[PDB]
Each structure stands twice: as C-alpha cells, then as structure tokens.
Amino acid sequence: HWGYGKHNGPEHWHKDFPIAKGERQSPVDIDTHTAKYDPSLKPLSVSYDQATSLRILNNGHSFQVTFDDSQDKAVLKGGPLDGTYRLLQFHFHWGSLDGQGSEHTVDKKKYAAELHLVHWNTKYGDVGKAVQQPDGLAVLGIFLKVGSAKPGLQKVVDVLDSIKTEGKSADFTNFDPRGLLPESLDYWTYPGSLTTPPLAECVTWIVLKEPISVSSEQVLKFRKLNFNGEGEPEELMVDNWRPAQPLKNRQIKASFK
Numbered sequence: 377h378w379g380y381g382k383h384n385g386p387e388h389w390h391k392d393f394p395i396a397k398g399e400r401q402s403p404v405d406i407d408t409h410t411a412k413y414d415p416s417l418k419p420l421s422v423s424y425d426q427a428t429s430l431r432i433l434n435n436g437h438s439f440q441v442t443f444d445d446s447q448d449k450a451v452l453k454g455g456p457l458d459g460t461y462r463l464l465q466f467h468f469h470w471g472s473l474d475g476q477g478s479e480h481t482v483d484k485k486k487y488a489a490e491l492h493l494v495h496w497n498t499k500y501g502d503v504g505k506a507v508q509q510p511d512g513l514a515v516l517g518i519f520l521k522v523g524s525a526k527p528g529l530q531k532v533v534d535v536l537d538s539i540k541t542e543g544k545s546a547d548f549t550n551f552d553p554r555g556l557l558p559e560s561l562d563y564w565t566y567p568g569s570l571t572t573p574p575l576a577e578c579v580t581w582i583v584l585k586e587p588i589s590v591s592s593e594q595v596l597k598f599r600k601l602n603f604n605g606e607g608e609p610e611e612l613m614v615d616n617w618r619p620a621q622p623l624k625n626r627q628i629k630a631s632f633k
C-alpha cells in the first residue's frame with residue numbers, strides 16, 4: 377500500500393508504521409561541521425572479492441541485485457562494527473531530476489541518487505532475525521553525482537529494460553560490486569533505520585564521503601523503470617527517496633579529519 381505518491385508517500389507511512397516517528401529514523405542530514413572525528417573508529421573492511429550475485433529484480437519501489445549470503449563471501453567488517461556483516465543485496469534511490477534523489481544529504485545538499493549496500497550481522501543467523509536487533513544491519517551508503525560514466529555500473533543499467541515493471545527479475549550472475557565503490561572509504565556513521573517500511577531501527581549507517589560519478593545516460597535509464605506492474609498504467613519509478621528525518625538524540629561520527 378505504501379509508496380512514494382501524494383496519498384501513500386513518506387508523510388503517510390507513520391499510520392501503518394508508527395516507528396516512522398521514532399528516535400533513530402533514517403535518512404538524516406549530515407551536518408559536516410557538527411560531525412565529530414572519532415579517532416577510535418577502527419579500520420573499515422569491505423571484502424567483496426568472493427561476492428556471488430544471483431538476480432536483479434524490480435520490487436515496485438526500487439531495483440535490487442541479490443547475493444548469496446548463505447556463507448561468508450562478501451562481508452563488511454571494521455569501522456564502527458562489531459563482528460561480520462554479510463552482503464545480501466544492493467539497490468538505489470534516485471530522483472526525477474539531477475538535483476534530488478539521495479536519501480541522506482550533506483549540509484542539505486541532495487545528490488542525484490544513493491546506492492545502499494545492505495549487510496546483516498551473522499551473529500543473528502538470518503536477516504529476518506537481524507532486523508529485530510539494534511545492531512542487526514549495516515548499510516554502506518554511497519552518493520551518486522552526474523558527470524562521467526561509472527564503468528562498473530553499466531552492466532546493471534544495460535539489463536534494466538528487462539525488469540521494467542514491478543515483479544520482473546532476471547539472472548544477474550558474476551557481477552562485481554567492487555566496481556561501484558569510490559576511491560576513498562572515508563565515512564560518516566550513525567545509528568538509524570531502514571528507509572522503507574517497516575522502518576525498523578536496526579541499521580548502523582556507514583555513509584561514504586566521496587560520491588561516485590555516473591553519466592546522465594546511466595541515470596536516465598534508472599528513470600525509465602516503472603513502479604507499476606506489467607499491463608497497468610505507467611508511473612515512472614522516480615523520486616523513490618525518503619527525506620531527511622530528525623536527528624534527535626544522536627551524534628554523527630566521522631572517520632576522517
């Protein structure tokens with residue numbers, strides 16, 4: 377029922393999901409002058425060499441690439457995290473225009489899109505159990521700006537015409553998510569939530585400072601996806617982002633000076 381329209385969008389979600397007005401909701405604005413460097417943040421470890429991608433799918437809200445998480449293969453460790461977090465899926469949020477689309481903002485700046493690499497804490501055994509825990513998930517968020525093409529994104533963009541509508545999926549094996557990462561792993565971190573229903577307060581957010589550049593042609597392909605299913609009225613999948621939520625009693629910590 378929920379979505380991103382006038383009558384079912386983020387301002388309505390609290391009726392079915394009262395945690396929408398909770399104490400650790402995401403996304404947030406990252407005020408760069410107020411975020412404090414934390415020298416105790418240990419090294420961040422993105423180990424994606426053995427990643428096994430499986431499928432790409434349009435779920436009616438975004439598109440996602442799924443991974444085999446039945447073994448420690450592609451894992452996130454270090455930084456603010458205790459333990460090992462397995463990569464389950466990545467997806468994006470994007471805008472109808474280049475000046476909006478990201479969920480997190482940086483000094484109120486919106487990027488054209490935001491990539492979320494979603495990982496879950498193996499101490500909880502499965503992702504469903506992890507989402508019930510305050511430290512169950514770790515999401516690596518990466519901003520996209522429009523400029524030069526990202527070569528490591530093109531394989532994704534070229535298959536989107538095959539998953540145009542909600543419920544479509546395709547094989548998407550042998551995709552290397554290392555090709556979506558910027559050079560620097562400098563990051564901000566804070567405790568937050570899923571940015572879609574159920575809005576569970578289970579996420580350690582790790583937002584990279586360095587955006588990746590994608591081309592206008594790449595993002596235009598995102599914008600031709602559909603929220604609707606096949607054989608229904610076409611509503612373009614654009615502006616599938618939740619706006620910044622109140623920071624409340626939280627501090628955003630920086631890994632860098």
Ligand SMILES: [Zn+2]
Pocket residue numbers: 467468469492571
């Ligand atoms: Zn997301």
